[PDB]
Amino acid sequence: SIAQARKLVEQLKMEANIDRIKVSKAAADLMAYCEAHAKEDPLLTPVPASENPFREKKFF
Amino acid sequence: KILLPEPSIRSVMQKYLEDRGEVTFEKIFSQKLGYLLFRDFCLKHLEEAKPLVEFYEEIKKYEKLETEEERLVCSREIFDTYIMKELLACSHPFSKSAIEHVQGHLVKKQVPPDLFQPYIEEICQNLRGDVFQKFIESDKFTRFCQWKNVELNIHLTMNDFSVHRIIGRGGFGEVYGCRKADTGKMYAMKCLDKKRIKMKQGETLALNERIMLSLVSTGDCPFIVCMSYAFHTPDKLSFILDLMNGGDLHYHLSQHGVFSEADMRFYAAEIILGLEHMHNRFVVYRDLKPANILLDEHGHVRISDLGLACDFSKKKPHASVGTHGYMAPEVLQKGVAYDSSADWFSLGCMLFKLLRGHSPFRQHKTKDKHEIDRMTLTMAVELPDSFSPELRSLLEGLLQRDVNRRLGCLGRGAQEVKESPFFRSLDWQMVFLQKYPPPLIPPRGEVNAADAFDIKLLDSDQELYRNFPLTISERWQQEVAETVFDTINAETDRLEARKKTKNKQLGHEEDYALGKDCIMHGYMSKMWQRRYFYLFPNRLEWRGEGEAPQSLLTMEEIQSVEETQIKERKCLLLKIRGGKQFVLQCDSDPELVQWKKELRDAYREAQQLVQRVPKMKNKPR
């Protein structure tokens, strides 16, 4: 397995050379996505019962 | 009456049999019912197979043909049809050596019974394999299983028979004539009393009889009282033997008086072939005397009561055992071994008694047994002048005091007796076929025909008799074949085609086991509610009739599968995870065996398998 631990290294090189970003921004982008679309999320912003298959919608 | 199972029993029996390697061609072809359903398949459902079975059947008939002239004619009829026609049709799948064996033998007008034997082997060759496999794929192997299930679940009682008038009475028991209800086959039922056996200390006698019977009751021997079944009741041992309602030669020697040379010769031959049968299978009869030879309706004879006989393949016996007038010198010598020679001196003694009305060493009605024993050893009996010189060389040969000089001892056995000048008129083939006319035909419905000159029991006693019940396969399969087999196969056929037209009309056609990974499926009952079961690698589903299964158990949740007893019957006992219990009852002894097997194989298998799967095993809680 001398052939094999050399393949692990050439892999780790790939994992290291990447453009990273600050956690601060990452989090900022997630949080901003969540608020962007929170009105389109029925689990947070309920819809009317008549438009909900699982409450009161009659026609399909 | 015999009711067969349903074609769904295949799934269980095929597995039962495969475990024992009885789903091969040799094991099925060589059974009577196996042969018959196989024959049927090759004759009616597979165009390549019919001329091979047809030919087979034709040779088998040729083998039975009595006269040399019949053979010459039949052999050329077999040649020109199954060799020459097949060959001109470019349709003869058989070797050169096979062809040239028969053609060689025919052109020289040699037509022995065995002539066709290379073709028996090469027919078998072409039947086993592709043909056999399609036969397993067919309804007929389905039907074989339906039949072979009924066989492996035989349990007899008195109520399976219909007992008629007595036909014998000895020291330990008494024989009756009966009918087996389901086939309507006539038999004799021996009924030995347990209470008497214990009282006279003949557990060794009763026991030895059954082991001995079993060792002789295959092959179809006309001249011994062979056994089809043995069984127990609360206080009786019952053998089911060949019916013989014509009394015994000791009773008939009383009525008729002595016989002639011609008349004793008849009884001689039929007895000699009886002895020959047991000596091929390494059994010495020993207790050969006229009281032990029996008669059918027609006046043909059989050898009876094998208690005092014993096996000699393993260890040649040395005791003096048997009746005193007719034992051999080496039998009476203590510490001296003996083989089949005991009987040929006995024969000689019995044969004299038929002619002269006493044992040849019992001189003057003398009960002094140790005078009959010293005349046997010192005296070479003098033979009256009346006796023919052909009769003398026989009786002298048979009553040589040395084993090294006696007839049938010099190495060729019965064949040395058959070759005596006394029997020079006889065709032994025709003796075997029972063709010679018997002397005494018994009077119709005679009273006292085959009679003799004559505390409790614990569990500890009946532990002797718990490996008593037996059923000889060859014999049961014969009985069936010659009575009900045909009409039941036709009854069961109409019955399974009416349920087809019914289950098609009601919708339920598609079978739930197919295209899946079902291990085994069949009927069982659970507490009793009867359902149909399907056993998969990871669960046991079940259904009622006319639905799909809506219920199951998993192989995970089964903890052990044990065998318990409920209401005088044997059952399976599944302990389930979380202490709950499942009980299954089965329709037959083979089904019970195989379910128990296949459930245990399955749950051990599954649990092992699941353990190695993170997404399926149990984890800590």
Binding site: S24, L43 | N538
Partner: protein, 339 residues
């Protein structure tokens, strides 16, 4: 000792990566989101129960219509339900009892499933003939199938206990691309929205990000203490969730290339069997071996609610594309649909 200098270059390179990330670690999501209002009390209720399977359910999957779902059980069967009525669309008895996973094609046209049979079997639900038939079997893997997902009607990614994933071509029946990398059984995979990328969790306690086309492991995320059983992309495609035997879920960011958050609680001791986001990404639903599903505030790590419905293990779950409902599937043999 070429094996010693490569076993020392590994431990060294590993630390280079630790450093590049600890330098991006300037704030915490918890800090960044400390200000936004909490989500509330989520009291979803059972709106449908789905009776049918005869034993444990192991897996399920919503169709893109947010209405039909496919479910895979120990009873050796796939059921395809119409959530709106509880009607069965199809019951599909299988060739193998040992099934573990199932998947519904985006189109509507096929479903897939697999197990200890070691083969992803494609089924066609609209044959010319109008019957549900196996239209393909995808043999290749040398271990059990634990999850699969379609890209389209001709392509499917699988993950096996042979420690590998693979993109197939359903016509050719062969592996277009093999994804070797994991050191232990691969339990779950999730596709990015654009389907040019996907992530996988494994019993080696790591998740991996792969490229569909170029076929290599781009990034590797550690931190879990124990087998990762499920994994799930966050809707924008930039982050993913995981669920482990260690009794935690975790959120991982792709560009920051490290763990942003941990969802857990000292009351919670059982392991996670499945994860799923609500539509906006704000809620993170998680299925557990204590017979509950927990709703987490993805941003704030608060536990917003509990779906408490089944009498055995919640084994699987999922939110509908239109966001309207969530389904759970348990070892109690029932699915339930909630909101």
């Amino acid at each position: 000792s070429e094996l010693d200098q490569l076993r020392q270059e590994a431990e060294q390179l590993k630390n280079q990566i630790r450093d590049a990330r600890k330098a991006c670690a300037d704030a915490t999501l918890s800090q960044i989101t400390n200000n936004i209002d909490p989500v509330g009390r989520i009291q979803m209720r059972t709106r449908r129960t789905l009776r049918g399977h005869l034993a444990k359910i192991y897996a399920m999957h919503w169709g893109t219509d947010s209405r039909l779902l496919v479910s895979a059980s120990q009873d050796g069967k796939l059921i395809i339900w119409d959530s709106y009525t509880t009607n069965k669309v199809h019951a599909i008895p299988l060739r193998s009892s040992w099934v573990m996973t199932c998947a519904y094609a985006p189109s509507g046209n096929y479903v897939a499933c697999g197990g200890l049979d070691n083969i992803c079997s494609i089924y066609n639900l609209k044959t010319r003939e109008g019957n549900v038939r196996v239209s393909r079997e995808l043999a290749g893997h040398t271990g059990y199938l634990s999850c699969c997902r379609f890209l389209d009607d001709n392509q499917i990614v699988t993950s096996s206990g042979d420690t590998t994933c693979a993109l197939w071509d359903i016509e050719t029946g062969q592996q277009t691309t093999t994804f070797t990398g994991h050191t232990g059984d691969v339990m779950s995979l999730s596709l990015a929205p654009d389907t040019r990328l996907f992530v996988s969790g494994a019993c080696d306690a790591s998740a991996k990000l792969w490229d569909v086309r170029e076929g290599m492991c781009r990034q590797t995320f550690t931190g879990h203490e124990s087998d990762i059983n499920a994994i799930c992309f966050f809707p924008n495609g930039n982050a993913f969730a995981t669920g482990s035997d260690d009794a935690t879920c975790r959120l991982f960011d792709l560009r920051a290339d490290q763990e942003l958050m941990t969802y857990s609680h000292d009351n919670i001791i059982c392991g996670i069997t499945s994860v799923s986001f609500s539509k906006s990404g704000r809620l993170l639903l998680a299925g557990y071996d204590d017979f509950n599903c927990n709703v987490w505030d993805a941003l704030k790590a608060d536990r917003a609610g509990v779906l408490a419905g089944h009498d055995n293990r919640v084994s699987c779950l999922g939110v509908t594309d239109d966001g309207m409902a969530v389904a759970t599937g348990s070892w109690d043999s029932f699915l339930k649909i909630w909101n």
